[PDB]
Amino acid sequence: TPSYSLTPAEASAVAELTLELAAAYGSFGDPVLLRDLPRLAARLPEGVQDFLREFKLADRHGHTVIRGHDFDQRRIGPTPDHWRGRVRPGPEFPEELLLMLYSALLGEPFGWATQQDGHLVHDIFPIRSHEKQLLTWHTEDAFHPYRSDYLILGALRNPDHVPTTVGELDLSSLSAEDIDVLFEPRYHIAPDESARFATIQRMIDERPLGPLLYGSRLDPYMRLDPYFTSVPQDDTDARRAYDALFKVVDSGMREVVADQGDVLFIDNHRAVHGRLPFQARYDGTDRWLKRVCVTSDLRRSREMRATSATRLLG
Amino acid sequence: TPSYSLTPAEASAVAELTLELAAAYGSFGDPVLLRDLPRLAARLPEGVQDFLREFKLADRHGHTVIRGHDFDQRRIGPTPDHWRGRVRPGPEFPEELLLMLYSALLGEPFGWATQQDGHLVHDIFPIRSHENDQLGMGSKQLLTWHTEDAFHPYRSDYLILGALRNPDHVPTTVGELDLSSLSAEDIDVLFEPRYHIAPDESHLPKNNTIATEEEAARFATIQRMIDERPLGPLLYGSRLDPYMRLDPYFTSVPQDDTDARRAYDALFKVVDSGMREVVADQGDVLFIDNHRAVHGRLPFQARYDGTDRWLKRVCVTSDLRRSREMRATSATRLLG
Ligand SMILES: [Fe+3]
Ligand SMILES: [Fe+3]
């Protein structure tokens, strides 16, 4: 897995640009910032832009990391208790901007109106409120036709080096028989728990059966969320193939640590991901990540978006 | 319809950048150029960048034009007799890069493997042997309007046409949907899966080789569409400001569906009467939203003497990986 290590000079330039932009724009509520994003991302160090572009175009690896950012711990301040009621943007606005810049290099930032107040940057920190742990991995929103194409995870702080899990598809293990079955529309994937108007909420609803593999039959994409995946009982070939696919992916899972100053890029088409359970202090010094969802085609999701301009689904 | 007119200064800066890039890069066969495209496009005049970005994000107008480019006629040379057997790249390489920079501001340039040797930037000029019938390389005969490859799930999201020369000012026809000209009842019908759109003969899997699994799977979805003949909508997106796919020559309204026939005829009249002539004169670059506009060309008399109309054409996709199944490798931008 290729990764990019920032020099002190690259890290200083990135930090400086990130502070200049934060002072220049109000928030992500500023429509002109969302407009300028791709042009702004061109002001990043050229090696960083080149690296990400190669990741995007290569379409080979499930994940990549840019390491060595300068995330000023004094400015960022203590890891908050919760996300709701918290004034946005915070002092960590610079870092959120960075992820939005990276997102603009891979596509467009988008989010869910019903998730975290519909903020384009998600918070990932221990919560005393929302508190034997099963170890799960999934494709992000595997059921959804307009699911993320990429995820960007920025490690603001990670004092105990708690890894993320990411897994890819090894084809050598699977037979051609099983692959062909998985490519066919024979599987149900269920949604999740996720204003009055216009045509209320649940719009373009639940419909057909779909495949688990797609794209190239020699190097396929996947959407795999094992907990919410069911196969019709009469379909024994599909059940045999789903079993074999699960074994390959489950047994291939890797631990990847996003330490402080790391940005992890996950390809939602080539890789599954999962959180790892960890003992939290709850004292403002806890592990803290930011997450941005990236779509390659914003217009493809128009029917589930309130307006043309909005990047929030639902 | 909003447009952008380059000041002579912007025109000068664009040409300079374009010449520099032409010298620094060998051809489009260079993967690094494809890699560098959007970082390179960030070197264009800032007004231009902001203009296209606003066009892309507004998702309202179906076409726009950037006018006032300096396309140097001495450097570009005579309009060629044919696209086959030309030295790649030609003396007009700088103009090709410009269109590739523009495409990179809207998405990713892509092509069709069997079209003009698989070049990302297409030539549009009269070819004598091609002068009998309707196409983009003839001249004498009418090109009735349409959505590009309306049937195809991975059709272009945008088209970019650059006018290297147009001495007789032969316009391009483009038409949009005036939604207020249709009844609410007819709109509901058009959003429903009640219509058959047939592929152009060029996309038929039986055209290419029957050999191997790799090639069979690469056409398997298109072949399924031909065998099952699924019915589809002609309007989609949001019911308030909808996308359209309308290729009248390849659209079948099933005989017994009377509601569909009424709605279609209605949609046809609106789009036919809204057809506008947009002249892509020398130095003009036309952007077409393939989800919000239809396009065609007018018939014109060609001279075949190296002075004829010459356009360059690039196809843009907003999501390159969506079409992976129909591409030989991950690297290739060519479907088929
Ligand atoms: Fe997740
Ligand atoms: Fe056409």
Automatic annotation (TrEMBL), chain A:
| Enzyme category, top tier | oxidoreductase
Q: Where does 2-oxoglutarate 2 bind?
A: 164, 275, 287, 291
Give the binding site residues for succinate.
164, 287, 291
| Sample GO molecular function, one term | iron ion binding
UniProt binding sites for 2-oxoglutarate 1 = 164, 287, 291
**Residues annotated as binding Fe cation:** 138, 140, 273
**Catalytic activity, EC:** 1.14.11.41
For this entry, the protein name equals Hydroxylase
